[PDB]
Design a protein around this motif. Structure first.
Motif, PDB file in Angstrom:
ATOM      1  N   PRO A 195      -0.821  -8.260   3.262  1.00  0.00           N
ATOM      2  CA  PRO A 195      -0.378  -7.212   3.748  1.00  0.00           C
ATOM      3  C   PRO A 195      -0.640  -8.071   4.920  1.00  0.00           C
ATOM      4  O   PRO A 195      -2.018  -8.601   5.475  1.00  0.00           O
ATOM      5  CB  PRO A 195      -0.989  -6.798   3.422  1.00  0.00           C
ATOM      6  CG  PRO A 195      -1.334  -7.302   1.696  1.00  0.00           C
ATOM      7  CD  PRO A 195      -1.555  -8.479   2.037  1.00  0.00           C
ATOM      8  N   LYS A 218     -11.942  -1.551   8.622  1.00  0.00           N
ATOM      9  CA  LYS A 218     -10.636  -1.676   8.828  1.00  0.00           C
ATOM     10  C   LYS A 218     -10.019  -0.385   7.718  1.00  0.00           C
ATOM     11  O   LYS A 218     -11.713   0.461   7.431  1.00  0.00           O
ATOM     12  CB  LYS A 218     -10.873  -2.676   6.720  1.00  0.00           C
ATOM     13  CG  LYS A 218     -11.237  -3.955   7.452  1.00  0.00           C
ATOM     14  CD  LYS A 218     -10.505  -4.791   6.833  1.00  0.00           C
ATOM     15  CE  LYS A 218     -10.924  -6.576   7.483  1.00  0.00           C
ATOM     16  NZ  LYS A 218     -11.730  -6.822   6.629  1.00  0.00           N
ATOM     17  N   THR A 263      -2.398  -2.967  13.195  1.00  0.00           N
ATOM     18  CA  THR A 263      -2.163  -3.440  12.733  1.00  0.00           C
ATOM     19  C   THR A 263      -1.947  -5.064  13.179  1.00  0.00           C
ATOM     20  O   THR A 263      -1.035  -5.268  13.230  1.00  0.00           O
ATOM     21  CB  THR A 263      -0.587  -3.605  11.868  1.00  0.00           C
ATOM     22  OG1 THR A 263      -0.319  -2.334  10.904  1.00  0.00           O
ATOM     23  CG2 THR A 263      -0.760  -4.157  10.505  1.00  0.00           C
ATOM     24  N   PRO A 272      -4.700   2.545   2.866  1.00  0.00           N
ATOM     25  CA  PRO A 272      -3.390   3.023   2.470  1.00  0.00           C
ATOM     26  C   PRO A 272      -2.502   4.496   2.751  1.00  0.00           C
ATOM     27  O   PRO A 272      -1.612   4.669   3.111  1.00  0.00           O
ATOM     28  CB  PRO A 272      -2.227   2.844   1.338  1.00  0.00           C
ATOM     29  CG  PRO A 272      -3.800   2.628   0.188  1.00  0.00           C
ATOM     30  CD  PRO A 272      -4.915   2.007   0.787  1.00  0.00           C
ATOM     31  N   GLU A 273      -3.824   5.046   1.975  1.00  0.00           N
ATOM     32  CA  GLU A 273      -3.657   6.515   2.972  1.00  0.00           C
ATOM     33  C   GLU A 273      -3.428   6.481   4.545  1.00  0.00           C
ATOM     34  O   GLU A 273      -2.983   7.962   4.890  1.00  0.00           O
ATOM     35  CB  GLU A 273      -4.867   7.599   2.448  1.00  0.00           C
ATOM     36  CG  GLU A 273      -6.353   7.593   3.189  1.00  0.00           C
ATOM     37  CD  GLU A 273      -7.054   6.275   2.357  1.00  0.00           C
ATOM     38  OE1 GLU A 273      -6.487   5.340   2.337  1.00  0.00           O
ATOM     39  OE2 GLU A 273      -7.943   5.994   3.318  1.00  0.00           O
ATOM     40  N   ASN A 274      -4.243   5.980   4.977  1.00  0.00           N
ATOM     41  CA  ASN A 274      -3.486   5.892   6.876  1.00  0.00           C
ATOM     42  C   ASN A 274      -2.193   5.969   6.686  1.00  0.00           C
ATOM     43  O   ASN A 274      -2.062   4.440   6.987  1.00  0.00           O
ATOM     44  CB  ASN A 274      -4.750   5.088   7.399  1.00  0.00           C
ATOM     45  CG  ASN A 274      -4.365   5.519   8.928  1.00  0.00           C
ATOM     46  OD1 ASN A 274      -3.155   6.302   9.353  1.00  0.00           O
ATOM     47  ND2 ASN A 274      -5.181   5.504   9.816  1.00  0.00           N
ATOM     48  N   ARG A 334      -5.603  -4.237   8.508  1.00  0.00           N
ATOM     49  CA  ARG A 334      -5.517  -2.486   8.976  1.00  0.00           C
ATOM     50  C   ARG A 334      -6.749  -2.173   9.628  1.00  0.00           C
ATOM     51  O   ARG A 334      -7.830  -2.211   8.868  1.00  0.00           O
ATOM     52  CB  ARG A 334      -4.995  -1.608   7.793  1.00  0.00           C
ATOM     53  CG  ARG A 334      -3.641  -1.775   7.700  1.00  0.00           C
ATOM     54  CD  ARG A 334      -2.200  -1.399   8.794  1.00  0.00           C
ATOM     55  NE  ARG A 334      -2.751   0.245   8.478  1.00  0.00           N
ATOM     56  CZ  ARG A 334      -1.975   1.212   8.760  1.00  0.00           C
ATOM     57  NH1 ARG A 334      -1.654   0.926  10.089  1.00  0.00           N
ATOM     58  NH2 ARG A 334      -2.158   2.365   8.698  1.00  0.00           N
TER      59      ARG A 334
END
Ligand SMILES: C=CC(=O)N(C)CCc1ccc(Cl)c(Oc2cc(Cl)cc(C#N)c2)c1
Ligand SMILES: [Mg+2]
Lengths: 405, 541
Positions: free
Chosen positions: A133, A45, A124, A48-50, A136
């Motif tokens: 969501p 996993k 994703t 969100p920085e990616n 990821r």
């Protein structure tokens, strides 16, 4: 153990490609698959920085009922720095009596991936109706379908097979992405054996499946002209139209004496006897067409172009070339989904890609006789190869469909 | 002290190469500076910020705005946004209500207190510094930097949702009999359990949020949730009723928006009309349905929620003039949703290709909302479809479908022959124009000696080639063979348009509809093909 260094091209970021909608059953399979891969550390996993993303979907390979995960690394592949240090293409692979194709993808995962690069392999699993969501993930080990996976892995690969190669010195082995192509000049029973023998090195150092292709073929098919005992005005109009078209491929094609017959204003179904001049002109055109074209050379720098025409009744013609009218290979596929045009076109693209890997070691760019929105909606439901080529879309009916029937 | 679990930090970084912000603190009033010091002092008491020394060279302008009761600090991060990295936006497409499934009970919780319980990456706090200008500029302003996701920073939404999701995952995994949705500073938890066994499961979730120190207020929203422009009710959904205002545009998006539940929301004459300069009257009399658009939106329409144990069905209709209308449902007249499809801008087209594209659009829409393809009901005969796809030069496909007999029906308007017709007159046609003069001729000669040449003004080679063909269609009987050298005209006719922009094409189509048999044959030009050799002389000069 040693993550080989890797980086994108200069002045280029990682891919940010939108994930397309997947069906519930394909979401479920990808969840089960990715849960096991995570417990094996192949993926992890991410947060969100990616911002990078690569589309993902699910297929069933040929002769198997188990879902397989396929990643559309086409964007990543075109931005990964071209690798070096030798794969040369074996011109004998296309000449072998037999060639089996082995799915060796899983070998890639036994190899760590350069830490700094993993963020570019982000993908994703989507959720139905966007309720939760996406899941990821990024790769930890060399991913399937990535260009640098065969390059990087070339080190250990050559060692897994030096014994077998030393033993069978005229069996030809070639690698393209996740596939091993094994060519012999022997019989299938001994082929299956020598194949299953090569499947033992793999199990020791989808490996159970293969493709039974016989590169035995006839290269660029000849242009052929009717032989008739009586010619109507329409038979001769069509012949003159075909010979005019072939004249842009072949020199010295002549239609003067055949057009002389078409002088007048006759009904289309009227039989026209042929002149002595006309029959010689047709024979000389026929002789010209028997020799292949002359100045035809493959250039490894340029792209391969593949055109496909739907001929009806489950027949498809295709031509591979690099400059128009200098064909490197032409072919014709017959009955093989007799109520599904799109399944057939997809199978056609796959076979044409496979043949193009065998002959040249790269994939062509297709010109599909299909509307973009229809192909984009449905091709993934019939796709069964670990690779994906590029395509574009023909929206005007080519006159030339007839000249390949 | 009950130990709280830390919320794991998201490593944030600035865009590669870029440095932080260095904006200048704008001049305030003594009153405003007085207000900001009160706010920042309370926030500091909460950990939300911390006073910094003089080393940070980054500053973000701070403002004050008042009043309902008081003032509030507005920190303008517009310049830090420009310099902070890109984030994975945790969602960009919203759910569609038609995909929601019902639940007996839906409780709502307030999770706003958690937003400022999400720490900022330490190495990034430096970039959140701001200055409260001091009174009379006679001392160094007070300097702060955020310790939590700032309200208004680029990364705050993605990091917040991302963080809430990670907390909730184990609870949702262990209670599959509930569903959880997050929207602003509330959570929505629904289930089909008995009202008791559901109120307990809510108690467990407040317990579980405590293990991260998330103070969940213990206190009743409207049955009509107002969400993303919808009205979600316990049994139905609809759009939040919104209307459209004689000088005028933006009603296109409004009418489109209403069209996902209200049927027959035509947008053609309105969209035909279109910088923000001038509004002309509806010369196509768009008020024949524009006043009906106001009459359609006059009555209220509601959609139902999704029931995965029932099949999914999609029904399409031809509305005319490139307009298609559709409804998706599981039980008749209980629409989940509705919509429209407008033809792609092109020069020619036909009803079969538009219907195919409608089907593809609905298929993809349906996979998004429900994760499956619907069964289609279409106004086209099985036989019509088979003939189309067996003979169309392109590959085409339509997933499982059945014929619905709702006129108007999609049909094939003509079908060219594959072989020359025996005993039909053969018309060799040809046409040509002068590039300089725009003068040309169109005409034909036939095996029976019939002939014509018509001179034309203001025309092109393409138009005269079409006109020649039109002339032979006009002057022949019910069966006819036509021989052209126009690759242009063959390209048009073999694509089988049933409707055109060019009025010449439309007249040819209208002649084609009236014939019984047409064979169209192509020969190359300037090659002495007789007939076409004889008519080329008559029409070239
Ligand atoms: C009023 C609707 C309702 O009672 N139903 C039982 C059906 C919709 C539903 C089911 C289950 C949950 Cl948990 C639910 O909660 C949500 C979901 C979404 Cl997408 C947005 C909002 C808001 N605001 C609230 C909403
Ligand atoms: Mg012409």
């Amino acid at each position: 153990i040693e993550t080989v260094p890797v980086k994108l091209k200069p002045g280029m970021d990682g891919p940010k490609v939108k994930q397309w909608p997947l069906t519930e059953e394909k979401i479920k399979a990808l969840v089960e698959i990715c849960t096991e891969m995570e417990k094996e550390g192949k993926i992890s996993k991410i947060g969100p920085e990616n911002p990078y993303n690569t589309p993902v979907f699910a297929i069933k390979k040929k002769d198997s009922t188990k879902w397989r995960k396929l990643v559309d690394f086409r964007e990543l592949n075109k931005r990964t720095q071209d690798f070096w240090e030798v794969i040369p293409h074996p011109a004998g692979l296309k000449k072998k009596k037999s060639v089996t194709v082995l799915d060796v993808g899983d070998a890639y995962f036994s190899v760590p991936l350069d830490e700094d690069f993993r963020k570019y392999t982000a993908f994703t699993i989507p959720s139905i109706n966007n309720e939760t969501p996406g899941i990821r993930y990024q790769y930890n080990v060399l991913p399937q379908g990535w260009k640098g996976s065969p390059a990087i892995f070339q080190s250990s690969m050559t060692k897994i097979l030096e014994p077998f190669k030393k033993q069978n010195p005229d069996i030809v082995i070639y690698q393209y992405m996740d596939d091993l192509y094994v060519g012999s000049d022997l019989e299938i029973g001994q082929h299956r054996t020598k194949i299953e023998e090569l499947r033992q090195h793999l199990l020791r150092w989808f490996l159970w499946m293969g493709y039974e292709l016989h590169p035995d073929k006839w290269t660029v098919q000849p242009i052929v002209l009717p032989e008739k005992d009586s010619w109507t005005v329409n038979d001769i109009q069509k012949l003159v139209g075909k010979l005019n078209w072939a004249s842009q491929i072949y020199p010295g094609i002549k239609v003067r004496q055949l057009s002389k017959l078409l002088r007048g204003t006759k009904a289309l179904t009227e039989v026209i006897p042929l002149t002595e001049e006309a029959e010689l002109e047709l024979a000389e055109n026929r002789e010209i067409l028997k020799e292949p074209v002359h100045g035809v050379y493959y250039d490894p720098s340029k792209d391969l172009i593949a055109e496909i025409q739907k001929q009806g009744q489950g027949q498809w013609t295709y031509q591979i070339y690099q400059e128009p009218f200098k064909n490197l290979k032409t072919g014709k596929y017959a009955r093989m989904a007799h109520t599904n045009d799109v399944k057939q076109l997809t199978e056609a693209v796959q076979k044409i890609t496979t043949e193009s890997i065998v002959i040249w070691g790269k994939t062509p760019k297709f010109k599909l006789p299909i509307q973009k929105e229809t192909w984009e909606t449905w091709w993934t439901e019939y796709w069964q190869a670990t690779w994906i080529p590029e395509w574009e879309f023909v929206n005007t009916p080519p006159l030339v469909k007839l000249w390949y029937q | 002290m009950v130990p709280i679990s830390p919320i794991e930090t998201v490593p944030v970084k600035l865009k590669p190469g870029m440095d932080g912000p260095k904006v200048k603190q704008w001049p305030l009033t003594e009153e405003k500076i007085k207000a900001l010091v009160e706010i920042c002092t309370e926030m500091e008491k909460e950990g939300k910020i911390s006073k910094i020394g003089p080393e940070n060279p980054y500053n973000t302008p701070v403002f004050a705005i008042k009043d309902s009761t008081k003032w509030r600090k507005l920190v303008d991060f517009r310049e830090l946004n420009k310099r902070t990295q890109d984030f994975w936006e945790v969602q960009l497409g919203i759910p569609h209500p038609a995909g929601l499934k019902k639940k007996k009970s839906v409780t709502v919780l307030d999770v706003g207190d958690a937003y400022f319980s999400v720490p900022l990456d330490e190495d990034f706090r430096k970039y959140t510094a701001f200055t409260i200008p001091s009174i009379n500029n006679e001392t160094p302003g007070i300097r702060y930097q955020y310790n939590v996701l700032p309200q208004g920073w680029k990364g705050s939404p993605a990091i917040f949702q991302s963080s809430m999701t990670k907390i909730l995952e184990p609870f949702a995994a262990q209670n599959p009999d509930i569903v959880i949705y997050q929207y602003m500073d509330d959570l929505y938890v629904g289930s089909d359990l008995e009202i008791g066994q559901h109120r307990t499961k809510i108690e467990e979730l407040r317990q579980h949020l405590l293990r991260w120190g998330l103070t969940t207020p213990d206190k009743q929203k409207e049955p009509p949730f107002l969400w993303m422009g919808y009205e979600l009710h316990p049994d139905k959904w609809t759009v939040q009723p919104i209307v459209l205002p004689s000088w005028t545009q933006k009603l296109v998006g409004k009418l489109n928006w209403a069209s996902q539940i209200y049927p027959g929301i035509k947008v053609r004459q309105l969209s035909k009309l279109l910088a923000l300069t001038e509004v002309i009257p509806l010369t196509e009399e768009a008020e024949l349905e524009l006043a009906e658009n106001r009459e359609i939106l006059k009555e209220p329409v509601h959609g139902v929620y999704y029931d995965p144990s029932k099949d999914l069905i999609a029904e399409i209709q031809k509305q005319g003039q490139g307009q298609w209308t559709y409804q998706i449902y599981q039980e008749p007249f209980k629409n989940l949703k509705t919509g429209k499809y407008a033809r792609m801008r092109g020069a020619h087209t036909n009803d079969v290709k538009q219907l195919t594209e409608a089907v593809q659009k609905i298929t993809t829409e349906s996979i998004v909302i429900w994760g499956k393809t619907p069964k289609f009901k279409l106004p086209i005969q099985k036989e019509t479809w088979e003939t189309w796809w067996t003979e169309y030069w392109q590959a085409t496909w339509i997933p499982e479908w059945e014929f619905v007999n709702t006129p108007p029906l999609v049909k094939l308007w003509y079908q060219l022959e594959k072989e020359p017709i025996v005993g039909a007159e053969t018309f060799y046609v040809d046409g040509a124009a002068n590039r300089e003069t725009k003068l040309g001729k169109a005409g034909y000669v036939t095996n029976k000696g019939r002939q014509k040449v018509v001179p034309l003004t203001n025309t092109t080679n393409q138009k005269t080639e079409l006109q020649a063909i039109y002339l032979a269609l006009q002057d022949s009987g019910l069966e006819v063979n036509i021989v052209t050298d126009s690759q242009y005209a063959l390209g048009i006719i073999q694509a089988q348009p049933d409707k055109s922009e060019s009025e010449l094409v439309n007249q040819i189509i209208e002649q084609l509809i009236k014939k019984e048999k047409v064979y169209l044959a192509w020969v190359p030009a300037h090659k002495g093909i007789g007939g076409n050799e004889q008519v080329d002389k008559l029409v070239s000069a």
